[PDB]
């Protein structure tokens, strides 16, 4: 009954998805043929048809072939019901005005129909989990499209969005800045909890904790996978202070607009190093507020924790957690806000972190801190500058105003992210009265 439906848009989505579904399978047990070698701990991500066919519950979507055709011809070929994987013919060519206008109004209908069939088999959809990549059309345009229509249809549900926000420096495209400022609405008005990640930081986590000096994308999307699992762990497996998707939101999203939380896993150590550490509840809790093990390039010592929700999993006994949370409240470098006294929603599941043939060591204790910091304005700003630097010379704008988007959009988009920064920037200041 506790079913959640995933929607992977874009190469980022399709790829991050393959990563998440190897874990979901390795977790519940569903092997790469649907069969579960030798109890309802699967209804969330897997829909079972008579005769263990544990079919998935997602809709991988890309406006170009390739990306998805690797899953259609890969090891997990006999799992994703052919239809679920929905593909087109031409990419949006990093043009939001292609995913949201031209090459995009051709797949929006079929995807929303597959999403219905999945959301018609569920007895209680608890929320939709999206995975885009502000940067391309199938990650900014088609998302906006899908989200704008999903909200109207599946209204009183949820839309926990996971995104790969442009980095503060590297980036991979010259039109990334534009697309992101343009996808602001999909994250501000048509979402419920936007967890934003950035490749640079997950790459720092890798070149520092896992000891991998040449991190690929695979390594990165596996880290995104363990973060998602921890969030959807108190719906499949069992625990003491279990917490659902609806609960996270309450003890996080403070005001309706303020809903851009940041994520940080805890024991991101590697086999060898994890022989010199005790990885106790305090080691993991402290190394989650650490201004480096964070997943977005943003020092939290520049903002005010508005509400951090900590989701543990494994040999965590309520007592240790309570003791640890207290230590954090002693350290005064981790200043909180003055309007959220009790600023911690603890959640404890049991299933210890599952390990895929890869890197992150097998541990008996982990945590994932979904926190709502005020230090996210720095990311908002880094991007604001890049957009403002190019929109002045109206560079790379012809492509957009030639696929539909009338200039007016860019301008509105700008104002939106502007107001957004005001909201955050001015919400941690102390009581003037």
């Amino acid at each position: 009954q506790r079913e959640c439906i995933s929607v992977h848009v874009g190469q980022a989505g399709v790829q991050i998805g393959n990563a998440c579904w190897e874990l979901y399978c390795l977790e519940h047990g569903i092997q790469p043929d649907g069969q579960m070698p030798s109890d309802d701990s699967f209804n969330t991500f897997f829909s079972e048809t008579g005769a263990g066919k544990h079919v998935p519950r997602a809709v991988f979507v890309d406006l170009e072939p390739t990306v998805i055709d690797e899953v259609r011809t890969g090891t997990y070929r006999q799992l994703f019901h052919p239809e679920q994987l929905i593909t087109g013919k031409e990419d949006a060519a990093n043009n939001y005005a292609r995913g949201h206008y031209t090459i995009g109004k051709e797949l929006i209908d079929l995807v929303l129909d597959r999403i219905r069939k999945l959301a018609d088999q569920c007895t209680g959809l608890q929320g939709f989990l999206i995975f885009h990549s502000f940067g391309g059309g199938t990650g900014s345009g088609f998302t906006s499209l899908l989200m704008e229509r999903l909200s109207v249809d599946y209204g009183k549900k949820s839309k926990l969005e996971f995104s790969i926000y442009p980095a503060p420096q590297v980036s991979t495209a010259v039109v990334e800045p534009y697309n992101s400022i343009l996808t602001t609405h999909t994250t501000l008005e048509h979402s419920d909890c936007a967890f934003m990640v950035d490749n640079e930081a997950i790459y720092d986590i890798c070149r520092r904790n896992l000891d991998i000096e040449r991190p690929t994308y695979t390594n990165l999307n596996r880290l995104i996978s363990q973060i998602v699992s921890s969030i959807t762990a108190s719906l499949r497996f069992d625990g003491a202070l279990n917490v659902d998707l609806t609960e996270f939101q309450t003890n996080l999203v403070p005001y309706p607009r303020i809903h851009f939380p940041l994520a940080t896993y805890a024991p991101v150590i590697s086999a060898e190093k994890a022989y010199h550490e005790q990885l106790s509840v305090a080691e993991i809790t402290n190394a989650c507020f650490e201004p480096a093990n964070q997943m977005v390039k943003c020092d939290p010592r520049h903002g005010k924790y508005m509400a951090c929700c900590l989701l543990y999993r494994g040999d965590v006994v309520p007592k240790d957690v309570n003791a640890a949370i207290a230590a954090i409240k002693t350290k005064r470098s981790i200043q909180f806000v003055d309007w959220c006294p009790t600023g911690f929603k603890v959640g404890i599941n049991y299933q210890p972190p599952t390990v895929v043939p890869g890197d992150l060591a097998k541990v008996q204790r982990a945590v994932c801190m979904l926190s709502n910091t005020t230090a996210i304005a720095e990311a908002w700003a880094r991007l604001d500058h890049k957009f403002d630097l190019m929109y002045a010379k109206r560079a790379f704008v012809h492509w957009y105003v030639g696929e539909g988007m009338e200039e007016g959009e860019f301008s509105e988009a700008r104002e939106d992210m502007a107001a957004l920064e005001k909201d955050y920037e001015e919400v941690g200041m102390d009581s003037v009265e």
Binding site: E106, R116, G155, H190, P256, H259, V427, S431
Partner: protein, 72 residues
């Protein structure tokens, strides 16, 4: 009295008064014309005459008015 003079300052009463589209959706609203099922998604809005439309793909059977209608 301090609660009123504090609640109606500005930089948080604006945040409390404003609400996003999704927040507006989940405030016990009531939308009658929608899609409760795929049998409504295929049928109530399709814009495809089965008598007139000839030889169309799976993605051409369902073309919504909101799909061919302007944004927002």
């Amino acid at each position: 009295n301090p609660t009123h003079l504090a609640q109606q300052q500005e930089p948080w009463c604006r945040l409390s008064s404003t609400a996003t589209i999704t927040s507006m959706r989940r405030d016990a609203c009531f939308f009658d014309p929608e899609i409760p099922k795929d049998d409504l998604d295929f049928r109530l809005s399709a814009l495809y005459n089965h008598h007139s439309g000839t030889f169309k793909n799976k993605s051409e059977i369902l073309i919504h008015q909101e799909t061919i209608q302007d944004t927002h």
